[PDB]
Design a protein around this ligand. Structure first.
Ligand SMILES: O=C(COP(=O)(O)O)[C@H](O)[C@H](O)COP(=O)(O)O
Ligand SMILES: O=C(COP(=O)(O)O)[C@H](O)[C@H](O)COP(=O)(O)O
Ligand SMILES: [Mg+2]
Ligand SMILES: [Mg+2]
Lengths: 458, 459
């Protein structure tokens, strides 16, 4: 059974890329107990391409041309790469452009539950030039945010943010005054994933009061501020009535708002509403239950790599990354390339080198309780400091709390940009130097015998 | 974080159910090793509700009466059951309605990655009368489809259909041509999931031709044909534009066009577009890729039960429920269980009972095929026959060609309905008689002694 039509292991991998007619894919799939690797590969190509359940030829002439082909396999590492003709893709009748829906439908649809396949995790795709340019892409990225913070649009550095504690629980005013309280030291305020229009903290009235406390905090600080308004809806016209609300209530302050969409749990149409309708605004892609299917444990679906890479194409200005709250204490691996794939114009994915031809970076939105002492070092490995940061541990960790934690963090960046070594810079700006007094065991190994040098104990 | 405050192991479940201010959720959650069960559940209860990472506040002190509780655990069986107050769920600034997206961020959220939990899968949800009442609901079902086939709205029966095969290839006349010819047996066609505008076979023509083909078949048969057209796009305005091209091209027989949206690979806003812009047509929700969560090789997400229950609330006209397709010792994501939650105004799930308060229903959309002879035994374990059968002409494997298959299997349901044992029907209806010849494998064993009484000679 199943074929020898959907396999051609002689096709050169590079000759394919260069030709530019196919989208390639790279999965780790182990067939259920008993089945052939090849037969299982071609089945899966078959269930993602053309079908024709059992038997014969049917009308024929071209079905047998636009056939997805398996061009390479490793049974031992469990490596299937499948090459999908570009004609199979589905473009709008509206404006002729690609749609992630289809890319997903084909490459990880009825594939994820099908026949002789027992787990299949897509680990990387390659898009040709005739298909890459049908894609939307980010409209904006941290440059329009640097641009609002009066920084230089090329290498502007780090935006310091927070998520207001608590998550849910704050009435409008207190909410609005806990927004005040951090704009006074940091530049960005988020809105946790769920906040919108609860009965006990309505959207209309909270967003009026935040807009306000934006103006007072701008005023006392001289410095511009940035807010992310969660406009996640099911109905795509509430999504619009939220965003149009929020942006016209911010008035003149409208450029300072970033639109939050949790595009994992509402779908590529919440996100394609945000973008397409508000292309000017920063489309913050908060994730969520990305772990249903992207966790290392789940052996089916796709990896985080693939979640972020698709995002660039959809058109997300920024997307969460870095996963801390534990996460290191044994050596880890290979989702480092998330970074250069999101921002560089030509990079090496895990199987394929991608080329985005002038298609805008989407920025790493970083998270965790990484405090200003850990940071100097993270900006070195990555190499630049061009990411939005959202904290909890570094802000709330500092002993003088909120405004100071935030101040210690913009202070750990300057030291890095300006080439001056943290320990020294500690000496001058209290906030930074009290960052070391804040997180002790983090102090004594990053910056050994800091004590003597900072002005205290030995 | 904590334990305390986020635990009230003493809150009786039915007290929680009787009042109705809380959404109840059931999960199969196992802590990573060293971690200590109730503590961890509290820490799950906090990452899905109020947060409260210590000295952070609601200053006046205490506004934790919007705090999600742990009301039950069974450490061995890994059962974490949680209570979500209702004020937490996001409503809408324009109409008042709740949203599956909110529902979905408060439960199906950031617990799906949390570092001190190895997995957690939702098994069921209770969704009360004040929250359930804010929520789309199906605005039509199998009964709008039945009313155009020319049948009664109540206890009204089986709609049979196919999937055009091959799934992709065929430039436009061939795909039209393949529709018409199936439209001489069967009722309903749907394009496969990857179909819209492939350059080789484009929506604009490919749909005009389909509509042309529709009227050829409804001349020559006297009876009505249904089409389920795939109008799935990333952009709502595209979703709508495709969608209004189809109902205007099909025009005079625009009420026979079901609307297909791929529901997993495009989320809720894709579903919500059709649901509200085309309230008037079948919203077919075809669940592609669900497998990544639901398929039981996966321990994180929701199950097929949960995926179909909330798709009801949202507004699918009919969803591809599955197939009975089993053997021996049941449970482990039942076709009956689900079916019963999607149709029945007051069903029971694996933990909770729910009272849909006058919704409407989302028709199970069964797929596989138990040809002619096996069918009425499908209809028995169910207890009705009001679904749609989409089959791979496996179900329509017939000496006479798949024209007699769709009629053979249509015949088996008329038979069941009216209720005169399949066999006495086969003398009377040929494709049924011949439906036996095609299937000696069942049509002997599954339908008793037919040789003597029916269809001819041979051994
Ligand atoms: O709840 C938080 C808090 O921690 P923090 O203080 O770092 O904001 C965040 O919303 C996500 O957990 C992290 O986002 P990501 O999806 O990028 O991991
Ligand atoms: O392409 C097919 C194979 O068809 P068949 O099963 O008839 O051979 C099916 O339509 C869907 O993949 C499953 O749909 P469902 O939600 O009903 O499982
Ligand atoms: Mg959060
Ligand atoms: Mg199908």
């Amino acid at each position: 059974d199943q074929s020898s039509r959907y396999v051609n292991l002689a096709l050169k991998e590079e000759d394919l890329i260069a030709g530019g007619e196919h989208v390639l894919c790279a999965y780790i799939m182990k067939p259920k107990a008993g089945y052939g690797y090849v037969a299982t590969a071609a089945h899966f190509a078959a269930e993602s391409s053309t079908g024709t359940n059992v038997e014969v030829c049917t009308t024929d002439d071209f079905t047998r041309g636009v056939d997805a082909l398996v061009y390479e396999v490793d049974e031992a590492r469990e490596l299937t790469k499948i090459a999908y003709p570009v004609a199979l893709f589905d473009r709008n009748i509206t404006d002729g452009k690609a749609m992630i829906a289809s890319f997903l439908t084909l490459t990880m649809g009825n594939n994820q539950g099908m026949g002789d396949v027992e787990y299949a995790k897509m680990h990387d795709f390659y898009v040709p030039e005739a298909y890459r340019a049908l894609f939307d892409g980010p409209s904006v990225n941290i440059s329009a945010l640097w641009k609002v913070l009066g920084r230089p649009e090329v290498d502007g550095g780090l935006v310091v943010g927070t998520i207001i504690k608590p998550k849910l629980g704050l009435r409008p005013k207190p909410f609005a005054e806990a927004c005040h309280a951090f704009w006074l030291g940091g530049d960005f305020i988020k809105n946790d994933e769920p906040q919108g229009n609860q009965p006990f903290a309505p959207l209309r009235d909270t967003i009026a009061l935040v807009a306000d406390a934006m103006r007072r905090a701008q005023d006392e600080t001289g410095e511009a501020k940035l807010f992310s308004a969660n406009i996640t809806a099911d109905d795509p016209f509430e999504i619009i009535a939220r965003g149009e609300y929020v942006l016209e209530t911010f008035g003149e302050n409208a450029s300072h708002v970033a639109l939050l969409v949790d595009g994992y749990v509402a779908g590529a149409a919440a996100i394609t509403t945000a973008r397409r309708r508000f292309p000017d605004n920063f489309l913050h892609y908060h994730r969520a239950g990305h772990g249903a299917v992207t966790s290392p444990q789940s052996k089916r679906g796709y990896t985080a790599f693939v979640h972020c890479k698709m995002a660039r194409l959809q058109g997300a200005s920024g997307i969460h990354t870095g996963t801390m709250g534990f996460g290191k204490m044994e050596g880890e691996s290979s989702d480092r390339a998330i970074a250069y794939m999101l921002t560089q114009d030509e990079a090496q994915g895990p199987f394929y080198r991608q080329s985005w031809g002038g298609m805008k970076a989407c920025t790493p939105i970083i998270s965790g309780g990484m405090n200003a002492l850990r940071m100097p070092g993270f900006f070195e490995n990555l190499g630049n400091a061009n990411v939005i940061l959202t904290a909890g541990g570094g802000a709330f960790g500092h002993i003088d709390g909120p405004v100071a934690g935030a101040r210690s963090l913009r202070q750990a960046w300057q030291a890095w940009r300006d080439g001056v070594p943290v320990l020294d810079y500690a000496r001058e700006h209290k906030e930074l130097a009290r960052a070391f007094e804040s997180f002790p065991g983090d102090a004594d190994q990053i910056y050994p015998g800091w004590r003597k040098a900072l002005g205290v104990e030995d």
